[PDB]
Amino acid sequence: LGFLGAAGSTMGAASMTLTVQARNLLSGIVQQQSNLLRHLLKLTVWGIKQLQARVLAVERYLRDQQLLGIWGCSGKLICCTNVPWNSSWSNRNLSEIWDNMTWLQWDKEISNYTQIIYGLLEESQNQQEKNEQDLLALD
């Protein structure tokens, strides 16, 4: 275990842990609450690099976390979707990918049409599914 501890292991192992990566993603001991505590101008070059790094920290976290909210998966770490898998994406079989490719390799295998999957993802799970209440919310 550890942060990215299973980065080189098979995809089945990264499926098993996963939180250790998600936990250490927003806040860090490195930030350490700023201030010297314990000259009186904090306009130094260091303060500029820190604050612009604290911004992109939450700017990149919220850019990805906004994606989880529009897919109905905000509350959980792994959610299933109602989008069928299209064979043009990969020809490999069920146990052939989860035990032989590792995630590091997999991100390069879908990076071509990865944005296209994201487009179809907002539709089937939250554009129609959240709409389907119309008939079932009350009759």
Partner: protein, 451 residues
């Protein structure tokens, strides 16, 4: 088979990108003596616990010449140096005609007793006082010699603050959230390539900004025999970094007993001139254990053997061309800036398979503008008292043998032409990556039908 897509938040995948990093260091200067030029009045404190994970099964490829952590390092030091000189005494009034004389030839003369006319506290009145200056920092104009500061011709001048430490202290570079720094834990790492032993430490090791020329000090050394790294070997032109396995100890000391003479030039501002010397004039020197040096120079030609024409003739020459301040082992020590003659170390040549100690002559300069920066130069005030530095020498910098088309032999003379390569000797193993926690994968699993 009705395979459905499923999302996974926190997937261990990354892509090479370079973001803005920041400082980290614990209790250093503090109360007794602070105001360090680099660590400022406050850096974010480093965690006492360092986090290193031996990433398994991974073989990420590094590149130390196309790595941007060294370029971020370069522009940070420049902006950090200029910020530590901006609020201080400017020495614009120091540009007057200087009438100077030798010192005690006794009819041996390398400093001059300068008399000149300078503004006082009151703008109306003027004052004449003496001061001593080193050679080359002043030049003649056209019976009684007449001189001028070498920088008044070029750019402006600003005195270094009196209570500022130019001592390199460890500065840690660490990543921003969603980022990680990858460490090459492979001992042998010829140039750069796929590293089998990677770690994803959140924070680098203790990196000291040792401002050095040609030869590196207080650096990091891998355990194997001396490493040789070139962006491209055989492109005679590209410079060569050299990592030792065991560092040599070189101690330097300035025997001059400088007295402090503070003369005001207007209000609050006070120029710190060299006073009158106490004791016989002695040239500054550097000691190198001749025994320790002969073997370090030998292990390199053994490693260089397998990289340059196998078994043939490898010679070492003195710098070769260039300017006086870049061809000598320049550095800072205690506040005064030394320039030592390296021709005494790169003269031997071995090929075909209580104790004496080499010494190096050194001169001192008080006028400096480093990193070939023609914007503004600074005057380093003379350090009152005794001077002694004792730092390990861990790295080296080499250069060409001209353009010998094939032929008989190869020679490598030192040439610390640039400053950014000095930090590349400390950053060969690191590289930062951007974590992408979003991964999508198929599995025969779908959520509830209606909702």
């Amino acid at each position: 088979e009705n395979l459905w897509v499923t999302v996974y938040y926190g997937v261990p995948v990354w892509k090479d990108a370079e973001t803005t990093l920041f400082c980290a260091s614990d209790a250093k200067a503090y109360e007794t003596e602070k105001h360090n030029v680099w660590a400022t009045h406050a850096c974010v404190p480093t965690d006492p616990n360092p986090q290193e994970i031996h990433l398994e099964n991974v073989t990420e490829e590094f590149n130390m010449w196309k790595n941007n952590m060294v370029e971020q390092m370069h522009t940070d030091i420049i902006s950090l140096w200029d910020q530590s000189l901006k609020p201080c005494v400017k020495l614009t009034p120091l540009c007057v005609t200087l009438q100077c004389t030798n010192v005690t030839n006794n009819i041996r003369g390398e400093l001059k007793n300068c008399s000149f006319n300078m503004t006082t506290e009151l703008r109306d009145k003027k004052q004449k006082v003496y001061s001593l200056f080193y050679r080359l920092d002043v030049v003649q104009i056209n019976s009684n010699k007449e001189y001028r500061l070498i920088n008044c011709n070029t750019s402006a001048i600003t005195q270094a603050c009196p209570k500022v430490s130019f001592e390199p202290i460890p500065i840690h570079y660490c990543a921003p959230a969603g980022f990680a720094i990858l460490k090459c834990k492979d001992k042998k790492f010829n140039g750069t390539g796929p590293c089998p032993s990677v770690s994803t430490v959140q924070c680098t090791h203790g990196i000291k900004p040792v401002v050095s020329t040609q030869l590196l000090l207080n650096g990091s050394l891998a355990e194997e025999e001396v490493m040789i790294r070139s962006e491209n070997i055989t492109n005679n032109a590209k410079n060569i970094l050299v990592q030792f396995n065991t560092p040599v100890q070189i101690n330097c000391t300035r025997p001059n007993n400088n007295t402090r003479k503070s003369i005001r030039i207007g209000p609050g501002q006070a120029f710190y001139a060299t006073g009158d010397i106490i004791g016989d004039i002695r040239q500054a020197h550097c000691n190198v254990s001749k025994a320790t040096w002969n073997e370090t120079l030998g292990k390199v030609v053994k490693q260089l053997r397998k990289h340059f024409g196998n078994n043939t003739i490898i010679r070492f020459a003195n710098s070769s061309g260039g300017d006086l301040e870049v061809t000598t082992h320049s550095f800072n020590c205690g506040g005064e800036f030394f320039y030592c003659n390296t021709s005494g170390l790169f003269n031997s040549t071995w090929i075909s398979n209580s104790n004496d100690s080499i010494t190096l002559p050194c001169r001192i300069k008080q006028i400096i503008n480093m990193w070939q920066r023609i914007g503004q130069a600074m005057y380093a005030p003379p350090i009152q008292g005794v001077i002694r530095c004792v730092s390990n020498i861990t790295g080296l910098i080499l250069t060409r043998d001209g353009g010998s088309t094939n032929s008989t032999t190869e020679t490598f003379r030192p040439g610390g032409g640039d400053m950014r390569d000095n930090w590349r000797s400390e950053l060969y193993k690191y590289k930062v990556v951007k974590i992408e926690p979003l991964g999508v994968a198929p599995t025969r699993c779908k959520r509830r039908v209606v909702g």
